[PDB]
Scaffold this active site. Structure first.
Site, short mmCIF file in Angstrom:
data_model
loop_
_atom_site.label_atom_id
_atom_site.label_comp_id
_atom_site.label_asym_id
_atom_site.label_seq_id
_atom_site.Cartn_x
_atom_site.Cartn_y
_atom_site.Cartn_z
N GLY A 228 0.85 -1.14 0.00
CA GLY A 228 0.00 0.00 0.00
C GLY A 228 0.89 1.19 0.00
O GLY A 228 2.08 1.10 0.30
N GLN B 62 5.02 3.82 2.55
CA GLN B 62 5.45 5.06 3.12
C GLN B 62 6.02 4.76 4.46
O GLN B 62 7.06 5.28 4.84
CB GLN B 62 4.27 6.04 3.32
N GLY C 235 -6.92 -1.59 -0.33
CA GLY C 235 -7.43 -2.91 -0.57
C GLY C 235 -6.25 -3.79 -0.79
O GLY C 235 -6.19 -4.91 -0.29
N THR C 236 -5.27 -3.29 -1.56
CA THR C 236 -4.12 -4.08 -1.90
C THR C 236 -3.39 -4.38 -0.63
O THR C 236 -2.96 -5.51 -0.41
CB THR C 236 -3.17 -3.37 -2.81
N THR D 207 -10.89 5.38 7.52
CA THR D 207 -10.41 6.17 6.43
C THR D 207 -11.41 6.05 5.34
O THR D 207 -11.85 7.05 4.76
CB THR D 207 -9.10 5.69 5.90
N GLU E 195 -11.77 -0.05 3.74
CA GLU E 195 -10.78 -0.63 4.60
C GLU E 195 -11.44 -1.64 5.49
O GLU E 195 -10.97 -2.77 5.57
CB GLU E 195 -10.07 0.39 5.49
N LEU F 234 11.29 -10.81 19.60
CA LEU F 234 10.00 -10.21 19.74
C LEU F 234 9.00 -11.31 19.80
O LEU F 234 8.07 -11.28 20.60
CB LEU F 234 9.64 -9.29 18.57
N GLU G 127 9.28 -14.31 20.77
CA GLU G 127 9.27 -14.99 22.03
C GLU G 127 8.54 -14.12 22.99
O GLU G 127 7.70 -14.60 23.76
CB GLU G 127 10.69 -15.19 22.59
#
Ligand code: G2P
Ligand code: GTP
Ligand code: ANP
Ligand code: MG
Ligand code: MG
Lengths: 438, 429, 350
Positions: A10, A15, A144-145, A179, A183, A252, A254
């Protein structure tokens, strides 16, 4: 060593990836040239460095990350970014396909194209790594992607990975506002499928983060990106801490595993605290105690929640750097006072609390004044559930509407499957609530 | 890429299209030199995608002009960037519609098709797939619409990928000199609705009001009116074309806006809109623009926006967007009307923002979602039709066309059904 | 009026066998209901149950229902009351299979003859006799509706070409609803003629191929039989009635991978899902009723309005595929059948 390169889907996901990567880049201090103005990192690229990016052009630290540009726009973004410059063009991959997308349509169609390319890239990276436990990737629910990618992608990767799970990042609309209608459409389908595949999920409150930034910066806008920076920072921080050497370092996964006694809550909540305004830093340095208070206080936590309202099946806060003695001292007391915290039935044990050896680090170019401690907390949050309910309410309404059948129909995705997803989500949420209650 | 050539049909389509081209070309900012005024390479790239490059990196328009009469083609060519446009794209037809829907439709279509394939190929060359083509025509002109319809139907059929969106001016139901004129409109309407899942129209009244206030001309300037109208349309395409921090698929949005393909109608919105003096003197605040879009006056279409509700609401953003502004937008929408938002789905409106604010005022807005008034407007329009039926006007034309009188009835019935359903839904939560 | 589906359960799918999964529902004709385990793995015992006027197990056959249904079939047709049948089930249900019924192999029996063939063929045959009995003028004008991109093709219609679209207008003959007229059909003298002709027609007719089922029509299949009847009563009053029967084989939900369908087929599939969903939509839409009259707009819905709550009368029989796999879809089906239940249609002579 194991290296994870995030995959961002997306525009938002990309970004985010840009920000996170860039933030890493800043941390690296390596120029967009790829040769760091800094000296070569210890051990060459650090294990973290390698993990984030495989090192090539040794003597030069060039990050490698995989980006998919469904839209050519993304590619421009990638190219625009410095990181791409470091990145060999091979690393960057752009989908020929448009996003386009209808949420349902996009993932299936797009994913296939991406998957082959990505898989190869992944495998090579995996080869590069001594072994990869899994990948941490960011995806955008709203697109959506973005949502679509995670579901399709996750399963395949999970299969490849086998037992070792991957960490998934998701974008969670704040329950307050969505949004777009689309979504939430993505959310249920993506989430239910994804959740099983993913060991955990990452939740972010887009609005909340914006709000949180908004307060400290005291500028709501501009910029969104600035808000993004904080988001990048927070995500960067948590990974960074693990990346950084620790007197005790926990993976993380764990940790998250620790966090939830049950797979039922795959996804820990993500929090950042304390949030510090630049000005506040100017006024004074944050106290450890202030840190402690800040961390607890719901404003600090990424999602706005009433701590009573939310229940934490378990709440843990990973801290960057070194946890101060203070911080630690203060913590027990906090936990103690806090009614809100829930219990597991079985056993009080099984957790870990954990400190990283490396001293606290501040991410460079931080918009906000540096905080002595940046921390994340993984917990179960009401807000996600409430958001779930909110989504559910909308979804049910949507169901009644039977609106946007066509979009799904175009996908050929089953309405029934969708309803099933909704049901599953409800089941998950309800189960989650049920488990959540002691 | 996925550039879409715009095709104009009908006398209006031709006239508008020329303006459209001018606006777009202006948007490109590509001079006859073919140099790119825009600093951004990408923007140049988009334009480059949009138009094939003449030497000097000139850009040559891809589109077909509908020749009601050859004069129109002459007009555009005579008009600026005549060189820029190349006649090969141009299609000619002296006869034009002949003001026969069937006649014009049949005669023109054959001519058009060849150009259509050629042009389509070019676009296909540009991008393998295009979202769809948007054509501008006059719905009111039966012939103009009729000619347009054939291409649209065929094209969409040809490529499922493409989505057919049309712009046509609706004759304002407010005034009809005669039933017969709207008779053309009804025919166009019936055809158009079937033809395109989504159709966009602007009320004549809306033009009248907007033109009248702004121009203060006794009669609207075609060019002037076209300019403004084109500009708003240009904004949407421009926005989509131009990158945004968040970009929304136009198609995706289009799919989004209508809960179902059924609702052809879309309600355009352009901003900022103010009086000439007003705009010059003062700049609207960001929230002001948002409010402005809400206001009927600002919106090109004339309606009582308070009265009307939006089954779906959407907003587009340009320039930097406040997070707060978004919230404000959400709040305002709720504030203005519960009806404004659909009961079915909360917070229908979603907006995407361009990375770079539009040329001219940084802040621009478009209005999304449909209003009750427009839907009523349609119903009103059909009202004329019924009278027309009573007239049995265009009986001769109908005969000559060979178009069914029954077909007209069917159009009325179908339109009635759709309008009824639309109105019922619109009225319904 | 409208009838809730009588369930014929497809025998345990070979494909289902491939899964070797148990069907969530146990196909028990005895139950005359099927339930899928709501508990599922969690609760095999627990199951959501759906009840229909009849539900049948795998053991049950299309024939079993078919004979029963078969008799009532004639009556609607004879009157000229429009009859329609829709089968509800997942793809590979045998929705088509039951619907068609099986001709005895090597066409030992014609479709009508076969009890193996579904209700329709027998009824068609019965109609043949019935027409004979009536001695009324019976002609069947045939139009084929094979729908691709909502395009109808009259393979069935003896013309090579597909019949022209019938005008969508309230047929003044038809009191209510929108009627399609101007249909070009070539009538066949006799039902037997129908038998032979149909064979020809079938060759003409094609369905989009489906990997999942060659048998399954990828597209929604619409087979229409129009019967013009003219008799002179004891009174000697000459009465003219028109009966019409729409036998529709809708595609089930499909996913491309599962389908193995061509992308275009998928495009059909999108239509396929859309159609059903649209249809799903109709009951939920159904309620407001005023004005924005929610009915006619779709072609399918348009036919539908006549179909149910319309001049034409249809009845619903559902056959299901044992596979649990399309749980959502099957659930959608089951719910939808219930959805259908909400609105009943009044039979009417065409
Ligand atoms: N909003 C606008 N409405 C216009 C414009 N020109 C005409 N019209 C309206 O459109 C209608 C006339 O249709 P056209 O301009 O397309 C004439 P067309 O080529 O379709 O057919 P003929 O009558 O055979 O010339 C009528 O209702 C006019 O009021 C225009 O530039 N803008
Ligand atoms: N984490 C994060 N989310 C963002 C950001 N900007 C927008 N979003 C959210 O991302 C979602 C939109 O997803 P996108 O990734 O932009 O869209 P996409 O997946 O590419 O799909 P399309 O644009 O529809 O083709 C919305 O829920 C936005 O609120 C950002 O900077 N960070
Ligand atoms: N009663 C049955 N006995 C044996 N085989 C069956 C039976 N019913 C269905 N099948 C088989 O399952 C495959 C058929 O699916 P059918 O063709 O039955 O699916 P369908 O309902 O037409 N699917 P769809 O067109 O997508 O709605 C066929 O090849 C049949 O032979
Ligand atoms: Mg995007
Ligand atoms: Mg079939």
């Amino acid at each position: 060593m194991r290296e994870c390169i995030s995959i961002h889907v997306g525009q938002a996901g990309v970004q985010i990836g840009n920000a996170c990567w860039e933030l890493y880049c800043l941390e690296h201090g390596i120029q967009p040239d790829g040769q760091m103005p800094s000296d070569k990192t210890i051990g060459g690229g650090d294990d973290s460095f390698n993990t984030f990016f495989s090192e090539t052009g040794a003597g030069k630290h060039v990050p490698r990350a995989v980006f998919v540009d469904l839209e050519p726009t993304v590619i421009d973004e990638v190219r625009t970014g410095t990181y791409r410059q470091l990145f060999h063009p091979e690393q960057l991959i752009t989908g020929k396909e448009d996003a386009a997308n209808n949420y349902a349509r996009g993932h299936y169609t797009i994913g296939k194209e991406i998957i082959d390319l990505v898989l190869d890239r992944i495998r090579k990276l995996a080869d590069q790594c001594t072994g990869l436990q899994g990948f941490l990737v960011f995806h955008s629910f709203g697109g959506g992607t973005g949502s679509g990618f995670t579901s399709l992608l996750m399963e395949r990767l999970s299969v490849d990975y086998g037992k070792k799970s991957k960490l998934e990042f998701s974008i969670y609309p704040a329950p307050q506002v969505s949004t777009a209608v689309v979504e939430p459409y993505n959310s249920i389908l993506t989430t239910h499928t994804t959740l099983e595949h993913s060991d955990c999920a990452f939740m972010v409150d887009n609005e909340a983060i914006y709000d949180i930034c908004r307060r400290n910066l005291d500028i709501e806008r501009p910029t969104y990106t600035n808000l993004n920076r904080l988001i990048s920072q927070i995500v960067s921080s948590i990974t960074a801490s693990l990346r950084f050497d620790g007197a005790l370092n926990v993976d993380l996964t764990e940790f998250q595993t620790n966090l939830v006694p049950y797979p039922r809550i795959h996804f820990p909540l993500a929090t950042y605290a304390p949030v510090i305004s630049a000005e506040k830093a100017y006024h004074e340095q944050l106290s450890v105690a202030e840190i402690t208070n800040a961390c607890f206080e719901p404003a600090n936590q990424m999602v706005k929640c009433d701590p009573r309202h939310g229940k934490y099946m378990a709440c843990c806060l990973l801290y960057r750097g070194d946890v101060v003695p203070k911080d630690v001292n203060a913590a027990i007391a906090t936990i103690k006072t806090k009614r809100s915290i829930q219990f597991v039935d079985w056993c009080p044990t099984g957790f870990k609390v954990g400190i990283n050896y490396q001293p606290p680090t501040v991410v460079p170019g931080g918009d906000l004044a540096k905080v002595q401690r940046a921390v994340c907390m993984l917990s179960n949050t009401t807000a996600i559930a409430e958001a779930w309910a909110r989504l559910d309410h909308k979804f049910d309404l949507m169901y009644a509407k039977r609106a946007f059948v066509h979009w799904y129909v175009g996908e050929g995705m089953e309405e029934g499957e969708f309803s099933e997803a909704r049901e599953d989500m409800a089941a998950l949420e309800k189960d989650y609530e049920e488990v959540g209650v002691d | 890429m996925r550039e879409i050539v715009h095709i104009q049909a009908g006398q209006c389509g031709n006239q508008i299209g020329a303006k459209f081209w001018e606006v777009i070309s202006d948007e490109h900012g590509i001079d006859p030199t073919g140099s790119y005024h825009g600093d951004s390479d990408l923007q140049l790239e988009r334009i480059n995608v949009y138009y094939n490059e003449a030497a000097g990196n000139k850009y040559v328009p891809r589109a077909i002009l509908v020749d009601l009469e050859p004069g129109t083609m002459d007009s555009v060519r005579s008009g600026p960037f005549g060189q820029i446009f190349r006649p090969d794209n141009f299609v000619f037809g002296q006869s034009g519609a002949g003001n026969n829907w069937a006649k014009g439709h049949y005669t023109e279509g054959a001519e058009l098709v060849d150009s259509v394939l050629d042009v389509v190929r070019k676009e296909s060359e540009s991008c393998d797939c295009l979202q769809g083509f948007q054509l501008t025509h006059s719905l009111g002109g039966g012939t103009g619409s009729g000619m347009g319809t054939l291409l649209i139907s065929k094209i969409r059929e040809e490529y499922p990928d493409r989505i057919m969106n049309t712009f046509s001016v609706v004759p304002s139901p407010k005034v009809s000199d005669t039933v017969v004129e709207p008779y053309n409109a009804t025919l166009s309407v019936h055809q158009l609705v079937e033809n395109t899942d989504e159709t966009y129209c602007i009320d004549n009244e809306a033009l009248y009001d907007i033109c009248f206030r702004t121009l203060k001309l006794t009669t609207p300037t075609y060019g002037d009116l076209n300019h403004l109208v084109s500009a708003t349309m240009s904004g949407v395409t421009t926005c989509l074309r131009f990158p945004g921090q968040l970009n929304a698929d136009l198609r995706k949005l289009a799919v989004n806006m209508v809960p179902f393909p059924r609702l052809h109608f879309f309600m355009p919105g352009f901003a900022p809109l103010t009086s000439r003096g007003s705009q010059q003197y003062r700049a609207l605040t960001v929230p002001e623009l948002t409010q402005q879009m809400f206001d009927a006056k600002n919106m090109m279409a004339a309606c009582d926006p308070r009265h009307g509700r939006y089954l779906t609401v959407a907003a587009v953003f340009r320039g930097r967007m406040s997070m707060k502004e978004v919230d404000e937008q959400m709040l305002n929408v709720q504030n203005k009307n519960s009806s404004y938002f659909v009961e079915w789905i909360p917070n229908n409106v979603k907006t995407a923002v361009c990375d770079i604010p539009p040329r001219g005022l940084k802040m621009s807005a478009t209005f999304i979602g449909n209003s009750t008034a427009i839907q009523e407007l349609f119903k009103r329009i059909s009202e004329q039709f019924t009278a027309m039926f009573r007239r049995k006007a265009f009986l001769h034309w109908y005969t000559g066309e060979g178009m069914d009188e029954m077909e007209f009835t069917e159009a009325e019935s179908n339109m009635n059904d759709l309008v009824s359903e639309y109105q019922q839904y619109q009225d319904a939560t | 009026k409208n009838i809730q589906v009588v369930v014929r359960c497809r025998p345990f799918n070979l494909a289902e066998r491939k899964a070797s999964a148990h069907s969530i529902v146990e196909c028990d004709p005895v139950r005359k209901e099927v339930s899928v385990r709501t508990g599922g793995l969690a609760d095999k015992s627990s199951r959501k149950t759906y009840t229909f006027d009849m539900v049948f197990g795998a053991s049950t056959k299309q024939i079993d229902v078919y004979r029963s249904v078969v008799c009532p079939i004639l009556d609607e047709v004879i009157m000229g009351y429009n009859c329609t049948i829709f089968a509800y089930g997942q793809t590979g249900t045998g929705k088509t299979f039951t619907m068609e019924g099986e001709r005895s192999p090597n066409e030992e029996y014609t479709w009508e003859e076969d009890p193996l063939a579904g209700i329709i063929p027998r009824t068609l045959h019965q109609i043949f006799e019935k027409l004979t009995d009536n001695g009324t003028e019976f002609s069947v004008k045939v139009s084929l509706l094979e729908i691709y991109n909502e395009e109808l093709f009259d393979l069935l219609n003896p013309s090579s070409d597909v019949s022209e679209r019938l005008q969508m207008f309230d047929d003044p003959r038809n009191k209510r609803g929108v009627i399609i007229k101007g249909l070009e059909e070539i009538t066949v003298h006799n039902k037997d003629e129908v038998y032979q002709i149909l064979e020809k027609g079938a060759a003409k007719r094609t369905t989009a191929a489906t990997l999942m089922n060659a048998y399954s029509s990828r597209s929604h299949s619409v087979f229409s039989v129009t019967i013009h009847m003219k008799e002179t009563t004891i009174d000697g009053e000459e009465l003219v009635k028109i009966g019409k029967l729409n036998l529709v084989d809708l595609a089930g939900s499909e996913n491309i991978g599962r389908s193995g369908a061509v992308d275009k087929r998928a495009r059909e599939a999108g239509n396929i899902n859309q159609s059903l969903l649209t249809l799903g939509r109709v009951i939920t839409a159904l309620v407001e009723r005023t004005p924005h009259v929610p009915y006619r707009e779709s072609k399918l819905t348009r036919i539908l309005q006549d179909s149910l709550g319309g001049r034409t009368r249809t009845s619903i029989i559902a056959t299901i595929s044992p596979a649990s796999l399309n749980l959502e879809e099957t659930l959608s089906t089951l719910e939808y059948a219930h959805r259908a239940k909400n609105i009943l249609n009044k039979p009417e002579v065409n």
